[PDB]
Structure formats: C-alpha cells, structure tokens
Amino acid sequence: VPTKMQVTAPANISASAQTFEVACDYNGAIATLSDDGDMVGTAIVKDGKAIIKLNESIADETNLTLTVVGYNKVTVIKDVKVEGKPYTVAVSGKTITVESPAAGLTIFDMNGRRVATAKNRMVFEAQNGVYAVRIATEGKTYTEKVIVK
C-alpha cells in the first residue's frame, strides 16, 4: 500500500514565468507541469524542493496541472491557474492582428516575455517564431498560440 507525501506549491503562476518551485518532503519525487499531456517542464525533488525550469512559454495556457510522483507514494495533483468566440487573432507574414472590442490584449514571445499590450485592437510586427496571445474580456480570458514564419 503506498504512503502519503507532503507537497506545497503555489496556486497560480505568471504567464511570463520561467520556473515554478514545488516543496516536497520526499526527496527524489518527480514534479511535472503539463497541459493535458503536453509536459511543459519537470524536475526532481532535491533537498526538499523541485525547481521546475519551463521548457517552453506557458503564456498560451490558462491552467496547468502539477503532478508529483514518488516511488511507493500516492501521486499528488494540483491545478495551477496561469495569469497574465468574441475575438480574432490573425497572422499575415510577420504581422499579428488581434481584435476584441472592450478586451485587454497581450502578446508574449517564445521566452514568455510580454511584447505587446493594447485595448480592443492591435497590429503587432513580429519576428519568426511562436507567440502567445491572451484576450481578457470581462468574465473570461482566451488564448491562442501563433506561428510567425
């Protein structure tokens, strides 16, 4: 029968984060952040903590799952909120056009850095790579992920 381990982690993570710290009383447990499969970073617990280095930007996510697994331990799972229909996000060559009347718009580069903020509409002049767009309306934030060639 497996035993329990203690796990403490934040309930929220910045859209711009590069790391996520997990405390755990079982050294050698593995703590992983994921979006429905897509594993976005993993670290082993050493000296009571795992410092997860993200392997990609999570700015295109509104939630992530934290899972901590240990040998003969009960797995621990926690939901983590990521914080930065009625919109469009358009790509044309190196431009990204975002439109959503009354909404806060933000774009993040592939390192998670916030590169643009505007209300209602913006055209962003991008470079080759992958961007996240977050569209914050009253009640709800939507996201899209954009490839610029």
Numbering used by the authors: 579 to 662, 672 to 736
Q: How does the study describe this entry?
A:
Here, we show for the first time that the OM translocation signal, a conserved CTD of RgpB, has a typical Ig-like fold encompassing seven antiparallel β-strands organized in two β-sheets that are packed against each other in a β-sandwich.
The three structures were solved and refined with diffraction data to 1.9 Å, 2.4 Å, and 2.1 Å resolution, respectively. Each variant of rIgSF-CTD formed nearly identical crystal structures (RMSD of 0.760 Å for r665i6H and 0.327 Å for r665sXa, with respect to r664i6H for 298 aligned residues). Regions with defined electron density included the residues V579-G662 (IgSF) and K672–K736 (CTD). The 9-residue linker (T663-D671) between the immunoglobulin-like subdomain and the CTD did not yield visible electron density, indicating that this fragment was disordered in the crystals. The overall fold of the rCTD distantly resembles that of the IgSF domain, and both domains superimpose with an RMSD of 2.11 Å for 63 aligned residues, despite sharing a sequence identity below 20%.
